[PDB]
DNA sequence: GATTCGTATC
DNA sequence: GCTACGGCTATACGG
């Protein structure tokens, strides 16, 4: 039944060595456990770095056959206030062993969105039964959590997942799939995910979708390009290369072209160009603050809804007069 | 009877055109069972809602809709208790068992689909409890978000849902669409008609057809017979007629202040939107030839300001008489 | 259907089903089909677990059709189905529990002549995780006592009228034939115990091992610290027993057999708190020197 | 070998710490509440922590109850802690006002409440609210004083979602008390103020006077002018003084002495906002150390229009045009920041630097005001009610609707002129 | 009773100052049916309400113009509800930002053509329109929503979509004139020259309800008698603005600015809007001749700056004070 | 914290 | 017949 499944719940890893990209803190959490002491931890990072997939390995490699009566999860989806971690966290805690297997783990799943008074409230309950009971703490935003609740939690910060992980996660599921991805493909694919295994294994489910014949055909960039409607890097370069030298009629022009023929959204364009415009020269400092403000104000105005046409004039009027200042 | 957007509302996947690549996907995750969470976003009146109907009806059938399928939008509560409760508890729910008829004349995949509608209205709070929901509760509950702007859905939410664009339906996109409604209903119309409709709602389709049906209303009542004209969408869209923006432009080129605050209170008092002046001032100035590169990006600028302030829900005679005077003074 | 039984008697059934009132009052319970009958287990914060079981001969019509499965397994609510079992009757109102395999509603017709009630209760997917988890471990029994259901049930009532915040479990036994058994309060009031008779129509039997199950030995006291919380989940259940037998190792989980077709059997199994203070227990022992 | 603010504690009514004026005035009120007339049946005593508001009722009575009582002397506290057995605890205080009533002639005894009743509770609050107003309206020809001592403290930062309002940020007598009993003619508020200077001086050298053999034993008698002075200069609490003194002649060593920070007032921190903070010339510590000791009174609406309303005293008006404008603008911001904690930071960094560059010597500046916003809104209320009635006979006459707005635009102005204009006709 | 009921229109035919517009509501009224959702967009006076009316009618015929007030209650919020034959109507006036509910509940007891009236839908908050860009489409069935605003800039996106925009000019001031002089013929009050009757339209600015109210007052205090010369009664709220706007131009000082704050504050009391009131103040300070054109370009751009921060913020009394002492800076 | 008035005292 | 108990209920508190 675990063909009937989304790519992104069906390739979880089920052990720390298929975690890939946070080398690091796998093997800082093997030493720990084989070690024997585990000192409480929490995991931080950007979404889809996989600080569930290893904290929950981590569980089954420590408590086998019994990650069921050791580890108690707590996630956003539950309530999670004063009387719940007064009462359910308090008495998980504060119980034996149930064959003195070792500690009693307990993931906090995203633990940010909880109210002060509980992340509070659990300070307690982590130091008076830390003998036998280690807290994690997984968390997307650090600023939510009090700060005596960080000093009293070895952080460890999941990094977005490096080019070579995501890397080798794909070449994992082209095998598992039986599925051909070209090199660019694969590149756009690493572009798109922006360190988020979850990105790459949608857009590759529907890359596979969008193939009229997912065994003999390869997935090639323009699939993985259509299938999400992205930007190609030509199109941007396009209309980069318009907005900064063409009139103000052509880049138009080449912008409404842009847009209809293919359908890509102003956003993505916008940050694309930006992206571009990171690798600039730019000698003077005032094209710089022209630019980051104003293609700032257009995508602000752009997330709250408008005329399209008009935002897009004011993208290439802002560009046109922030490169201004070159000469 | 019916209105003719909710006449010709696509029933099967295969009426929604222009979207070809989501319901491409769908249509091919239909065969399979592998649906993902998918997060349906786009302009308004793109065919998300029709998209996502049509789907549900094709991969369960009528009988199996009403067991299977739950509907939440902003019409009903969606807070942080109805996500917590009715959610989770529809989620957990194991899957109906399909009749015979079901499984000979149906897919039915062993998922279920529930469909928030509009979640860009969901606070952030409630936005939380569903990162979990979604995720365990994958192999038998499937979720489709569908909202306008993606930006109001966090950044978990959009990394567990499948990116599902829905493009801009432009005069090459539903054109098709618009003339199939037009045959049918024996809508009779001039050359280059229908463009007009599609250009003045742009980005959406809803608008067209209904742009279309009230034309059509219009020349039956009329009696005439002959087809219907250009001006007479244009009109009827509250399109400003070409007169009264020239005279608008010879207002702004006259700088005195007196004489164009003069002419904006008449303007107003024709009843006339400053949304549609304004487009159709950016129309004009942008594409005129005789103004120069400088001129052009400040009268951008100063169009997006007056279009993100007019957004806001402002005064309409205030933006736009500063909006003549900044033109004027350029 | 696939299963399919019938009972006449729904008072038996429905005071069954209320022993497991105490628990969770709204939420879900797991209930086994098998050829046996049908059980009832449930369990509260992974430190307590109670099973009832009803044997095929409480029904009249039990037929277990399935065949592609050993045991049917499946999860519905608790408060829905005590309330449709808790029907009572004025004419016998024969039910007729049916479920039609997965994907069914666990359906329960009742049929009183004149009515025709019929309920359906739709089934969630699984507690999804491994149940066996509180079994006791049948090879280092630190003791094994049997006790009458009233005393028990009438000492639980006491310590749940006095607050009873923690609770203690004392178990030793001597070479001169005297037995003691008592439970310690830590309540409001401070520590209070309530010794239960060493006659052997209230405690029939007592033998305190020595984590083998085999050597009795005697002078070792057996000390329990149990959360009254989950001490008081039982409370009503001895209350319509006759026996109750209690089992606890070394590995500091407690289990009570309840006793009352060869009756109800209730299994419930318990975590033991991990007693932070050392000072509690000589404390404990201290006191129970008097 | 116990606390110094016991055992050395006040004996006769001179010990008691308070000014004349404010021991005058509370005498006479006792003496004006214990004659048989009862113009006045209960006292609301208000003020700061620890401003001898406890201190003086015991005395009072003592020279007081006595004199007047019957023949055939202390004071009759509320204990907030009895949990009856058959009484829910609002009852409590039900019970505690309904059986202090019985002491008129031959059982004469001070009614005192300082602990009150848990009000951030909203129901008990009311039942408490309505218990004092029967207290007033009560038809009993004789009634006992009775003194409610609400010690008003800036209420902290709190988990509670919303819980209406004012019991959530302080607990002053105007959130405790209703506007029925403030304005009842027979509550006499008497507010306190902190102790002096002179006086915190005065008790401290008697406490060390009492006790000298220690302090030159530890080498402090002949540092006890200064320590003296700078807890006399520090706070103005003279429990927490006391505390503070002791704690340092206990001690042997060269511990920094240290006391409890005082909570800036609304009108206190406006004027801070607006004219500075003479003890620190640095804008950025005083802004910072404001914001942390308390935000309660920072982030509520009210300060900003304090602000608004207030920063026209300045040189009694007469600042540049320009920097009331950048003043105001900076306000709007802020407005315009769906109030985030930076919006307030900046609305009043902006003010406060604006009125540093502007700061001239010998320049006399004028009083300050709450704003006037709760009489724009009851005035608005008003003219809600009678729109209200105007579209309600409008439609009981003749089937014709108007708008809201039209009716306060239109409608409003021209109804009289028109309608009573032609009733002179009739 | 007064003048504007007296002179109100009850019919499509009746209404005689828009011609286009009547037209196109007879081609809307002759399938009613296939009626689509209408938004009239139009400054206030022109006569929408009435148009509605009138449609309605021709749709549903006699007996629209009927009025059966009734009380209902919300969760306590117990707004007021005006039912009528096929015909409610809905103020958002009367529920600020706590519209959604009751305009949820309202919509789902009416649904049970049913033609619900909502006025003034610029009041409506983003919640109340959230919740009805799904109502309109679900039941789009057994209601018809007809909703009037001046101004559809506030108006989400979708809402505009699903219904339909129908303009509704001012009247001009030929026809006003035209209709003030039915008013005076069904009435006699003894116009000394028909001229009085276009100063009434121009100091009217194209409201056919202040011109009839204005006219109305006239009379009275001339003793159901007109004169050449009678006075001009504007509204007190716009004298009191005058007298800012001079108060503004002459005296340029900080006790000033508390003046014209004392005055801002009396015109909100007065219950009227911040938006119009900043409106008003900006358009009377650009009447003065003494100001120069640079001056006034920065009174315009103030005025849409703060009226932007008005609309992006809570309380009104900061964007105004703003306002006015950005204007007087920039006088001095 | 700033203003005005008011005693009380060295 | 009265009891001791099961179910009902008014309710102070809860979050
Ligand atoms: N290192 C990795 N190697 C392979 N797949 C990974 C890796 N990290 C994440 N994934 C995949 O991404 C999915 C989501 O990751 P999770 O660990 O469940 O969530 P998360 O990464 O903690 O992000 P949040 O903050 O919880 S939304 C997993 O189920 C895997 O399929
Ligand atoms: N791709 C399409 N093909 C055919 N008809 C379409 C398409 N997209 C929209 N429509 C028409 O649009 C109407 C229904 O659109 P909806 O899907 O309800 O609007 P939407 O896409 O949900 O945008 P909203 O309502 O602002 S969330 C019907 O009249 C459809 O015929
Ligand atoms: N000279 C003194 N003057 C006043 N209080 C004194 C003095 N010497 C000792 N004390 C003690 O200081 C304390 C002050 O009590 P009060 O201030 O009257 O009570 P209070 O004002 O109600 O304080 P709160 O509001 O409860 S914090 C009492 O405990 C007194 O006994
Ligand atoms: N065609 C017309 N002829 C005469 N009077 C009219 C006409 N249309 C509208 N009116 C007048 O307008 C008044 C109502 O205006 P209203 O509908 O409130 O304007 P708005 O919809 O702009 O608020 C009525 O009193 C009526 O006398
Ligand atoms: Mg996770
Ligand atoms: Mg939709
Ligand atoms: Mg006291």
């Known amino acids: 039944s675990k063909e009937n499944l989304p790519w992104v719940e069906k390739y979880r890893p089920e052990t720390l060595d298929e975690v890939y990209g946070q080398n690091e803190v796998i093997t800082t959490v093997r ?297 | ?139 038998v509950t499937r979720f489709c978000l569908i909202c306008n702007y993606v930006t109001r859905i966090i950044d978990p939410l959009a990394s567990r849902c499948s990116k599902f664009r829905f493009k801009a339906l432009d005069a090459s996109n539903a054109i098709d669409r618009l003339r199939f409604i037009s045959e049918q209903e024996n809508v009779k119309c001039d050359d280059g008609v229908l463009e007009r409709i599609l250009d003045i709602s742009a980005g959406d389709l809803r608008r067209g057809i209904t742009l279309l049906q009230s034309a059509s209303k219009g020349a039956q009542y009329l009696g005439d017979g002959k087809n219907i004209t250009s001006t007479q969408v244009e009109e009827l869209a509250g399109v400003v007629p070409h007169d009264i923006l020239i005279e608008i432009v010879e207002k702004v080129k006259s700088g005195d202040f007196d004489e164009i605050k003069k002419y904006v209170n008449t303007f107003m008092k024709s009843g006339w939107s400053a949304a549609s002046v304004v487009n159709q001032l950016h129309e004009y100035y942008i594409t005129n030839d005789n103004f120069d590169t400088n001129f052009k990006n400040q009268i951008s600028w100063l169009l997006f300001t007056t279009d993100s302030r007019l957004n806001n829900g402002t005064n309409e005679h205030i933006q736009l008489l500063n909006l003549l005077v900044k033109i004027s003074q350029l | 259907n696939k299963f399919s039984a019938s009972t006449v008697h729904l008072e038996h059934i429905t005071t069954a089903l209320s022993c497991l009132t105490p628990f969770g009052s709204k939420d879900d319970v797991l209930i086994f089909i098998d050829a046996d009958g049908l059980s009832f287990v449930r369990e509260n914060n992974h430190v307590i677990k109670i099973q009832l079981l009803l044997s095929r001969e409480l029904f009249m019509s039990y037929s277990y059709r399935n065949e592609t499965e050993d045991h049917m397994k499946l999860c519905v609510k608790i408060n829905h189905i005590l309330d449709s079992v808790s029907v009572m009757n004025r004419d016998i109102v024969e039910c007729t529990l049916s479920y039609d395999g997965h994907g069914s509603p666990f359906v329960l017709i009742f049929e009183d002549s ?76 401070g520590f209070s115990k309530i010794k239960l008779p060493s006659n052997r129509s209230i405690l029939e039997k007592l033998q305190v091992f020595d984590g083998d199950s085999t050597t009795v030995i005697d002078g070792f006291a057996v000390i329990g610290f149990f959360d009254f919380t989950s001490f008081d989940k039982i409370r009503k259940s ?6 109750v037998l209690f089992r606890m190792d070394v590995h500091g989980v407690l289990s009570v057999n309840i006793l009352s077709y060869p009756g109800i059997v209730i299994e419930v199994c318990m975590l033991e708190k991990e007693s932070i203070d050392e000072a509690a227990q000589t404390e404990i022992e201290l006191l129970m020197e008097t | 070998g116990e606390q110094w603010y016991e055992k050395f504690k006040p004996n006769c009514l001179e010990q008691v710490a308070i000014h004349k004026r404010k021991l005058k005035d509370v005498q006479e009120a006792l003496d004006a509440m214990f004659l048989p007339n009862a113009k006045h049946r209960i006292l609301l005593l208000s003020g700061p922590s620890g401003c001898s508001k406890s201190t003086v009722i015991k005395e009072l009575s003592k020279i007081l109850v006595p004199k007047y009582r019957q023949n055939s ?129 005065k008790h401290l050298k008697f406490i060390c006077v009492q006790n000298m053999k220690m302090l030159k034993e530890k080498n402090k008698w002949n540092k006890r002018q200064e320590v003296i002075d700078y807890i006399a200069q520090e706070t103005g609490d003279i429990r927490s003084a006391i505390t503070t003194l002791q704690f340092w002649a ?74 009331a404008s950048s003043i105001v603008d900076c306000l709007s911001e802020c407005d315009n920041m769906n109030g985030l904690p930076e919006s307030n930071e900046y609305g009043l960094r902006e003010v406060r630097k604006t009125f540093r560059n502007i700061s001239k010597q010998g320049h006399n500046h004028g009083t300050v005001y709450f704003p006037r916003e709760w009489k724009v809104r009851k005035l608005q209320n008003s003219f809600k009610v009678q729109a209200e009635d105007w579209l309600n006979v409008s439609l009981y006459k003749y089937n014709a609707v108007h708008s809201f707005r039209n009716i306060t635009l239109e409608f409003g102005y021209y109804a009289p002129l028109i309608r009573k204009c032609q009733s002179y006709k009739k | 009773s007064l003048w504007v009921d007296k002179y109100r229109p009850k019919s499509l035919n009746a209404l005689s100052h828009n011609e286009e517009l009547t037209n196109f509501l007879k081609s809307l009224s002759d399938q009613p049916r296939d009626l689509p959702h209408l938004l009239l967009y139009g400054p206030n006076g022109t006569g929408k309400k009435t148009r509605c009316m009138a449609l309605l009618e021709s749709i549903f015929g006699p007996g629209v113009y009927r009025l059966k007030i009734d009380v209902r209650q919300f969760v306590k919020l117990e707004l007021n509800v005006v039912s009528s034959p096929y015909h409610l109507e809905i103020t958002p006036s009367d529920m600020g930002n706590n519209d959604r509910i009751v305009i949820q509940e309202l919509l789902k007891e009416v649904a049970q053509y049913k033609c619900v009236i909502i006025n003034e839908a610029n009041s409506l908050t983003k919640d109340a329109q959230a919740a009805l860009r799904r109502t309109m489409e679900k039941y789009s069935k057994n209601i018809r929503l007809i909703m009037v605003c001046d101004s559809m800039s506030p108006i989400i996106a979708p809402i505009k979509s699903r219904c339909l925009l129908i303009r509704c000019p001012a009247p001009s001031d030929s026809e006003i004139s035209t209709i003030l002089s039915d008013v005076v013929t069904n009435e006699r009050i003894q116009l000394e020259t028909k001229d009085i009757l276009k100063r009434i339209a121009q100091a009217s600015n194209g409201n056919l309800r202040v011109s009839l109210l204005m006219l109305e007052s006239m009379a009275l205090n001339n003793e159901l008698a007109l004169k050449s010369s009678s006075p001009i009664i504007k509204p007190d709220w716009i004298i009191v603005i005058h007298k800012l706007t001079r108060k503004i131009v002459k005296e340029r000082s900080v006790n000033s600015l508390i003046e014209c704050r004392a005055v801002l504050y009396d015109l909100l009391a007065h219950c009227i809007p911040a938006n119009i009131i900043l409106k008003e103040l900006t358009f009377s300070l650009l009447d003065v001749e003494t100001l120069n054109t640079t001056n006034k370009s920065s009174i315009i751009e103030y005025s849409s700056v703060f009226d932007e921060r008005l609309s992006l913020g809570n309380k009104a009394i900061f964007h105004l004070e703003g306002f006015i002492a950005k204007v007087m800076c920039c006088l001095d």
């Open chain 3, 238 to 243: 001895t209350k319509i027993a006759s026996k």
């Open chain 4, 73 to 201: 002397h202390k004071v009759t506290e509320f204990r907030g802690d009895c949990i009856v057995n058959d009484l829910p605890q609002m009852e409590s205080f039900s019970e505690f006002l309904k059986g202090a009533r019985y002491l008129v002639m031959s059982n004469l005894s001070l009614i005192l409440i300082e602990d009150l009743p848990n009000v951030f509770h909203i129901d008990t609050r009311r039942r408490f609210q309505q218990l004092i107003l029967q207290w007033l309206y009560s038809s009993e020809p004789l009634l006992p004083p009775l003194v409610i001592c609400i010690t008003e403290c800036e209420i902290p930062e709190n988990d509670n979602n919303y819980r209406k309002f004012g019991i959530d940020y302080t607990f002053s007598a105007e959130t405790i008390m209703n506007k029925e009993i403030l304005m009842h003619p027979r509550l006499k508020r008497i507010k306190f103020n902190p102790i002096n200077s002179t006086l915190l001086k």
């Open chain 1, 31 to 327: 030493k720990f456990v084989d070690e024997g002491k585990l000192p409480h931890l929490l995991f931080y990072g950007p979404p889809g770095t996989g600080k569930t997939s290893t904290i929950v390995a981590l569980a089954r490699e420590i408590y086998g056959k019994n990650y069921s009566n050791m580890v108690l999860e707590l996630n956003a989806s539950d309530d999670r206030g004063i009387d719940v971690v007064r009462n359910q966290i308090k008495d998980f805690a504060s119980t034996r062993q149930i064959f003195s297997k070792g500690f009693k783990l307990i993931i906090l799943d995203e633990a940010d969105a909880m109210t002060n008074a509980a992340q509070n409230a659990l300070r307690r309950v982590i130091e008076r039964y830390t003998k036998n009971t280690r807290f994690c703490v997984l968390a997307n935003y650090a600023h939510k959590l009090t700060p005596a609740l960080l000093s009293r939690c070895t952080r460890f910060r999941f990094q977005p997942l490096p080019q070579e992980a995501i890397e080798r996660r794909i070449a994992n599921v082209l095998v598992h799939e039986k599925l051909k991805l070209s090199p660019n493909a694969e590149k756009a694919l690493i572009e798109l995910s922006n360190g988020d295994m979850r990105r790459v294994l949608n857009v590759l489910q529907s890359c596979k979708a969008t193939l009229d014949n997912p065994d003999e055909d390869e997935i090639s960039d323009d699939v993985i390009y259509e299938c999400c409607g992205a930007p190609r890097p030509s199109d941007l370069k396009a209309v980069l290369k318009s907005i900064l030298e063409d009139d103000w009629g052509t880049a138009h022009y080449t912008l409404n072209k842009v847009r209809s023929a293919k359908g890509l959204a102003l956003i993505d364009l916008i940050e694309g160009i930006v992206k571009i415009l990171e690798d600039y020269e730019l000698q003077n400092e005032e094209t710089r603050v022209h630019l980051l403000t104003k293609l700032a104000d257009i995508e602000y105005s752009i997330s709250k809804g408008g005329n399209d046409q008009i935002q897009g004039s004011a993208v290439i009027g802002a560009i046109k007069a922030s490169f201004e200042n070159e000469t």
């Open chain 3, 114 to 189: 004149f009515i025709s009630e019929r309920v359906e209760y739709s089934t969630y997917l699984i507690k999804d995780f491994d149940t066996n988890g509180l079994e006791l471990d049948r090879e280092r029994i630190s003791f094994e006592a049997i006790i009458k259901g009233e005393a028990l049930h009438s000492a639980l009532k006491d310590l749940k009228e006095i607050g009873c915040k923690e609770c203690y479990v004392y178990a030793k036994t001597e070479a001169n034939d005297e037995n003691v058994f008592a439970l310690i309060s830590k309540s409001q009031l």
């Open chain 4, 250 to 323: 206990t001690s042997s060593g060269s511990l920094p002495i240290s006391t409890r920070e005082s909570t800036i007032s609304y009108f206190h921190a406006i004027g801070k906002v607006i004219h500075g903070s003479h003890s620190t010339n640095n804008d950025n510590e005083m802004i910072n150390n404001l914001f942390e000791n308390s935000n309660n009174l920072l982030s509520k609406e009210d300060f900003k229009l304090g602000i608004l309303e207030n920063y026209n005293t300045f040189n009694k008006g007469e600042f540049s045009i320009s920097d």
């Open chain 2, 1 to 139: 009877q019916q209105p003719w957007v909710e006449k010709y509302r696509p029933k099967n996947l295969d009426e929604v055109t222009a979207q070809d690549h989501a319901v491409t996907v769908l249509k091919k995750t239909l065969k399979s069972a592998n649906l993902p969470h998918m997060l349906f976003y786009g302009p308004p009146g793109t065919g998300k809602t029709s998209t996502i109907l049509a789907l549900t009806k094709e991969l369960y059938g009528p009988d199996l809709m009403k067991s299977r399928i739950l509907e939440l939008n902003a019409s009903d509560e969606r807070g942080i208790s109805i996500v917590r409760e009715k959610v989770k508890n529809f989620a957990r729910l194991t899957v109906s068992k399909p009749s015979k008829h079901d499984l000979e004349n149906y897919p039915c995949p062993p998922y279920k689909i529930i469909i928030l509608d509009e979640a860009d209205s969901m606070t952030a709070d409630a936005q939380s409890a569903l990162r979990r929901t979604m995720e365990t509760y994958s192999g």
